[PDB]
Symmetry: D2
Subunit: 409 residues, 4 copies
Amino acid sequence: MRIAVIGGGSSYTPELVKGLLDISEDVRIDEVIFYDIDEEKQKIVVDFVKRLVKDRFKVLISDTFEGAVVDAKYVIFQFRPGGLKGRENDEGIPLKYGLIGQETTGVGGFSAALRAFPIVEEYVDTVRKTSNATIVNFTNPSGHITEFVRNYLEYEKFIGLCNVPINFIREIAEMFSARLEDVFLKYYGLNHLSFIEKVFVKGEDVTEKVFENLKLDEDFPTWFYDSVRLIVNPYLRYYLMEKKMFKKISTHELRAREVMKIEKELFEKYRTAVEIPEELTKRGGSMYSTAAAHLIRDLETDEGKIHIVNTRNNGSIENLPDDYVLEIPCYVRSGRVHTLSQGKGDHFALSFIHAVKMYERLTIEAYLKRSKKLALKALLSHPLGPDVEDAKDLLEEILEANREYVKLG
Amino acid sequence: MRIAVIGGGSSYTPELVKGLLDISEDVRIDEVIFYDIDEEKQKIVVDFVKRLVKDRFKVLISDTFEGAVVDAKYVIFQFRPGGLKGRENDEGIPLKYGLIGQETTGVGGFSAALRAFPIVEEYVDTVRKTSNATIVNFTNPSGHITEFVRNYLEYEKFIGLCNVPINFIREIAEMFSARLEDVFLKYYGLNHLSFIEKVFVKGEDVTEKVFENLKLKEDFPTWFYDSVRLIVNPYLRYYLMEKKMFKKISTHELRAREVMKIEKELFEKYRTAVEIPEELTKRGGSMYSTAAAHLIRDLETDEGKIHIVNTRNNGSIENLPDDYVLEIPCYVRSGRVHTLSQGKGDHFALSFIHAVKMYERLTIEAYLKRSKKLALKALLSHPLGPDVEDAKDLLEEILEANREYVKLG
Amino acid sequence: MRIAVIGGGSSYTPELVKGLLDISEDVRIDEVIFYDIDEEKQKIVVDFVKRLVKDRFKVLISDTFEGAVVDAKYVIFQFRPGGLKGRENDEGIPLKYGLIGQETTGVGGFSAALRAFPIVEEYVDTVRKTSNATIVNFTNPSGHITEFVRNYLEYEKFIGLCNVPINFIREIAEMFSARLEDVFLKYYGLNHLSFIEKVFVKGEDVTEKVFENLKLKEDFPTWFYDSVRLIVNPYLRYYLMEKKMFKKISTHELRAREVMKIEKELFEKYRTAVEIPEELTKRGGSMYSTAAAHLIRDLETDEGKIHIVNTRNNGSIENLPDDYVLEIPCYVRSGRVHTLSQGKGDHFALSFIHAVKMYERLTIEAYLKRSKKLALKALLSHPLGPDVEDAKDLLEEILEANREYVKLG
Amino acid sequence: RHMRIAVIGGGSSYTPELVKGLLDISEDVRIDEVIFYDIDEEKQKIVVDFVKRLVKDRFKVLISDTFEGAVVDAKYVIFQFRPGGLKGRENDEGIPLKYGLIGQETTGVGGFSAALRAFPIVEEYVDTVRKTSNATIVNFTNPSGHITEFVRNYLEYEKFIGLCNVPINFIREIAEMFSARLEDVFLKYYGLNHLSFIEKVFVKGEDVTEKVFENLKLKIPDEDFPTWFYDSVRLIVNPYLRYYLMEKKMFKKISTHELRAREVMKIEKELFEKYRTAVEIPEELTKRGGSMYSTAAAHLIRDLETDEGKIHIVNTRNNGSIENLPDDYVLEIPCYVRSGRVHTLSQGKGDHFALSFIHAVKMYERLTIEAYLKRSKKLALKALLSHPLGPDVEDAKDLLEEILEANREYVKLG
Ligand SMILES: NC(=O)c1ccc[n+]([C@@H]2O[C@H](COP(=O)([O-])OP(=O)(O)OC[C@H]3O[C@@H](n4cnc5c(N)ncnc54)[C@H](O)[C@@H]3O)[C@@H](O)[C@H]2O)c1
Ligand SMILES: NC(=O)c1ccc[n+]([C@@H]2O[C@H](COP(=O)([O-])OP(=O)(O)OC[C@H]3O[C@@H](n4cnc5c(N)ncnc54)[C@H](O)[C@@H]3O)[C@@H](O)[C@H]2O)c1
Ligand SMILES: NC(=O)c1ccc[n+]([C@@H]2O[C@H](COP(=O)([O-])OP(=O)(O)OC[C@H]3O[C@@H](n4cnc5c(N)ncnc54)[C@H](O)[C@@H]3O)[C@@H](O)[C@H]2O)c1
Ligand SMILES: NC(=O)c1ccc[n+]([C@@H]2O[C@H](COP(=O)([O-])OP(=O)(O)OC[C@H]3O[C@@H](n4cnc5c(N)ncnc54)[C@H](O)[C@@H]3O)[C@@H](O)[C@H]2O)c1
Ligand SMILES: O=P(O)(O)OC[C@H]1O[C@@H](O)[C@H](O)[C@@H](O)[C@@H]1O
Ligand SMILES: O=P(O)(O)OC[C@H]1O[C@@H](O)[C@H](O)[C@@H](O)[C@@H]1O
Ligand SMILES: O=P(O)(O)OC[C@H]1O[C@@H](O)[C@H](O)[C@@H](O)[C@@H]1O
Ligand SMILES: O=P(O)(O)OC[C@H]1O[C@@H](O)[C@H](O)[C@@H](O)[C@@H]1O
């Protein structure tokens, strides 16, 4: 059994490796092989990895992408198209037009996606022509990419992950002194655009208790939970509190800048660190890798476990089309991911899901036709996208900034 | 055969009557009966109407709604819940929050709907229990009210009308020196939120020619039509050019106030007019008349003719739910309206249609439950609604302004 | 404008030509070109045709299928795969097994379809690579072939026709002394498996009077119409009165043998006839001609007219999948066929439609895979098919008899 | 936390097996009392006295004189009564025969008259449960899938779970074949109760479908589907499909042998005599075809009580389990069962061959329910004609009349 990691130089790799080590007493892992376009960076992160693993498994570096995935049972997509410079443009350029600039949400999600599609296209193609492995995806925007792979590349074994579900389950498990697996949710939406309607702990409906603990400037007021009656992904603030979020983003250093500082600091510690450092929580992406590990674990056994994952709706939410990729709770058993019935989704949640899904497909369509025209159409459709008067200048600036990664005609 | 007109005192009534006189050669009309809450205003209008009609058919006033609709085959809703004063509040109140203020679109449409629902609820109930007439609805917001009547009151014979379709058809017929019925459209969306994908004149696909013509003709730039490839309802400006529209509305006289002036000038003229005054074109409701008379005419015969009308999708647009009320082309014959297959809707169009439909149903739900909390939820879901920080104060202003017409708890 | 007729040697050809001559005053027809695998038989018929036509248009014979369809705007499929010998096997073989033997219904329909599929595959392929004509199909089983072409060959411009709708409309038109176009139906089902729920004449619901008339008229008893409340295709007798129909078919001359006789008498008459002989009424295919000519006519103009036709459901019946090919009323205008909203189908009708549609697809699957195993599966799925104990011998007998036309492994 | 199970039809001869099942799960979940109700007090008393001897005071065993008294404080209610008794079953099987029609307890015309007898009793019972305990109802009463369609979609009582014994019997057979546990076996399984199909078989995650098909060929002779059938159809079929696909053979069998209902009366009279003194469940209870219904119900209740999450094949709304069937079809399908809830699992597309039966019988089911709700003789004729195994037009009226006269104590149609 071999796991390939694509983006082995990530500063989260130590966390992933820890995760793999914890399951490696319930599932046989013979090797973990790392690939990165940045050989010097990766070497450092993998050298640390090897001091953590201590021969419990083989740890390998492949010079090529093919060479990693060729024997792999699982491939983890962990790379950042365009680097932190890409992310800086994603965050900074939309501001100049009065728009939300954010890594995965709105115009920033649009350019990040455009940079991501050609790489995942090449990579999915290689995996399919070789090992036909299950691909586990962190690369953002993760739900958008999952929509693209499942419904346009039509590669079934591509599972989109993100950290908000596991984080929420962890808050709840802590809140009620229970295990993660004791928590069961009615959960649906898109990646970074999700809604929680019911919370169960050990089978007890604790939704009401959860709402009340949520009440006890930049967080939803109490009346909001009373009115909407959904627990809402924090990313919904960019939609529902746009003016407040814009004011925050536009008066401080960019978020990419400060993660870049956290990373540099981590890398320095990784040169000599024998234990995983603490400053690896100052990263808002924590627990992504723990979600990954538990997922691979439960894909490998025949126990049958629940994981909230990006995949085709297939009836999970009865009033959304089957083909919508959503972030939803699934029954994971023996290489298979089974969608679970949840009933109906709330009209308030659907107003966002529908809108952003349409935007997602228009973006993909623009990409496949490499069309500037269609890209403007996609940009105009996003609930946080430009007005007509700014749209064409915005796109121009995105294309200029991203010309090493995206070419549209 | 009797036609009831509810809101007889409308300044558009003369044009409606002209329309009715024109089809009166094709179909038998024995009487037109008028009802209005404002008897003195309606009396001047109806006196003028009698002068135009010259006993072509009987013209009556009923002192009650019930008296107007009891023996009617067709009932026309052309009343304005809350009057021009309500429209003034609709337009003016959102402005201080940085929000679009407009008669039918956005927050203004929300308050207009809340004023409309109790009145239409009583009116539909009375029609249903008496004549079971077909109701033809102009009252705004027309599509939203149709969604309410068809899907919540479950009165089948309620047809929402608007004047955009017939005006577009007219423009095309003039462009190509053809008759109205020669023009056939792939047309879908919501009332004031509609899209044209294909134009046929005498069977020829002339879509390109129409796009080419739009460029020669506050409007969407040429690249917009190249990009989006849809002909767009002018009201889409409020979504797509929000900043530009907000600036325009907020630095000029409220539309409601200019209509007040226009109406006062029309009413003085109506006292002695022998013919319809040209000044009735200063209103933006022209051709509403033709649309209603033509619909009634083709409801009466067994010919079978196409009318674009607000009704349940029923498979007109295959990637939208059957139950969505849409404004779409239907085959109209002998009292029945049959939806026509049109294929798939464009994702760009769907992004708007879905979001606003979810807003429509949230608004209806808040009304049916008489719920302040659910009204907040509805308001937040509109693409043109308030941020969380403004929503409470805005709703409280709306409910205070409309306290005579609606009560939420 | 050119119309291709495939199977020119048909005894119905003269009637088709009469139909085409009748529309030739409303629409331009330059030439009708005939193709048949039996040159000598066709020549006799075509020579007769020429005497009827009077050079009103050009009458041509093509030596090849390709030569017939190359410049054609319309292509009429009116050929019988395997001839009346095939039909004889169709009707006779299932009787030994205690099964209904019939040209289009049940096991006979199965073997008839198998014979047809290779020929229509080649033909549809040639048409789509050349003229891309609209194909109008008489060839039985018509609905089944339509399902094959629309959903498996994916050729959109294939319209399946049958003569029961037009004959039923004619019966009603005559009952109420009205024109064909005055009659409007709620009609749905499969070809030879159809149901009428509502009858309108000039807009008036006359359904009750039709039911009342049916009882003043092997037929369904009065109580049947009272209980089921559907007017039923006469072919439903083979399902609902199987025992009676079996007894009838099995104690009388096979219908195929009778039509051999009839055809031999017609063909001798055609040598000298100046007008269409009355003896052509002895065939049950009458009015097929009007149905096709009228369809072609209304496909050619921009009027918009109703024709009952085999095409994709597309929301016409809301509780049947969109992709079911059904026989339903459509609005036909300028080369397009639009499906019309009809509401819900009756569960009694659905019981038959679903089961036969599943049989249809199983049959197509078996053909596409050239699979004997899958053919057994298809055979067993038919409500009038063999029990398990007879299936193998029955199929073996069918494949042996049709060895020249179908090869399964 | 004190937990009570009601058993409706306590006098059933399967009750001892149900109790054995409940005893077995009583180590994993707390059961404080099992309360029994039956319309036939004297028959139930013999069975319950035997039950008390087996329970050995592990939980309280009670008899309620009324239905209401049984269900009032119940967390689970088990429907295991036969409307009209074995004499209703006798009429069900016997009456269609003279018309050349299949006569069977649950399938075809017999199922139709059985459903009509059941509907009024379940209507009353579900109404009482809903107005008191709002318990989960676990249903054995036949026809079980049809009654679930009726309760879920027309009475709109969500917590009604239809059960049958074929899924568990199949799962047991597979587990035996491969030396595995029941829970190691996972199926692509769908259809209607007594009208179900297996497309895929997994044991400990391995696809063993082929091996299972190969095994079927090696395995009541003239009544099994021949090998070519499995090669052709490529579905493992519920044995009840024999009545549809082997109709002439099944009609001949049923009509030239004693009515099953009459043999069951003999079997039952021997069981009841034994229950007077029995210390252990008699082997003669296997002579009944209902075995393992017990385990299925107890295992269901067990996993409804914990927060583990386990798979049970159960009758419930499709909700996307089979993507090419409507969501609202009640089907018999694998569900994730956890903490009082039943979640449907994605299975992909159903086979057209299977859909031909499922659609036709589902339409028949709803037409039957509609006839009953309107108390309509006309609509009952229409339902009867819709069933693949129903009468030709020429027989439908006389057949319906016979059925209504035999069932006049239980149903009245106008
Ligand atoms: N790894 C996690 O647990 C985690 C957590 C949160 C978010 N993410 C998402 O995963 C992605 C990685 O983010 P990160 O935080 O690890 O930052 P990161 O910048 O350290 O990215 C990881 C590595 O990917 C490499 N890379 C870039 N392009 C590549 C390509 N074409 N092929 C192979 N490698 C390439 C980079 O050299 C870098 O070392 C981002 O899109 C991020 O949003 C991951
Ligand atoms: N008349 C048209 O063809 C037309 C054209 C464009 C828009 N509309 C829509 O239809 C409505 C009519 O507005 P308008 O500008 O024509 O005229 P308007 O504002 O003068 O109102 C029409 C009449 O309705 C009456 N009215 C108010 N409430 C009523 C009630 N509860 N019952 C009966 N009558 C009542 C008023 O007294 C007035 O005489 C508006 O909602 C408008 O958006 C109508
Ligand atoms: N023509 C009509 O208006 C009409 C009416 C009823 C039914 N049909 C259907 O259409 C078909 C024709 O019926 P029919 O009574 O004329 O029978 P038919 O025996 O007269 O056959 C018609 C002609 O088709 C020709 N033919 C056979 N195979 C061919 C092939 N592969 N390519 C081209 N031509 C071929 C035959 O030689 C024959 O001349 C049948 O399937 C029938 O069910 C047609
Ligand atoms: N019990 C099981 O595990 C099992 C097994 C196979 C099939 N079934 C289905 O369950 C039902 C009962 O099966 P059975 O073989 O035990 O039959 P059964 O004849 O023994 O009936 C069971 C009990 O129900 C009682 N009863 C009848 N009407 C009642 C009513 N209205 N209220 C309460 N009790 C009533 C009878 O007195 C009898 O004691 C049948 O419908 C059968 O098809 C059950
Ligand atoms: O700013 P960062 O440290 O990169 O964290 C950003 C991360 O935040 C998490 O809450 C989101 O769910 C992730 O999808 C995202 O990658
Ligand atoms: O300002 P007004 O004269 O009232 O015109 C307002 C009107 O504008 C038209 O363009 C809309 O289609 C109408 O539905 C609307 O009511
Ligand atoms: O027996 P025949 O003369 O060939 O007539 C048979 C014809 O009967 C009609 O009622 C059917 O609608 C046709 O589809 C069929 O071909
Ligand atoms: O004749 P019986 O003993 O009543 O057994 C009949 C039983 O057989 C099983 O195979 C069925 O799954 C049961 O639902 C049925 O009731």
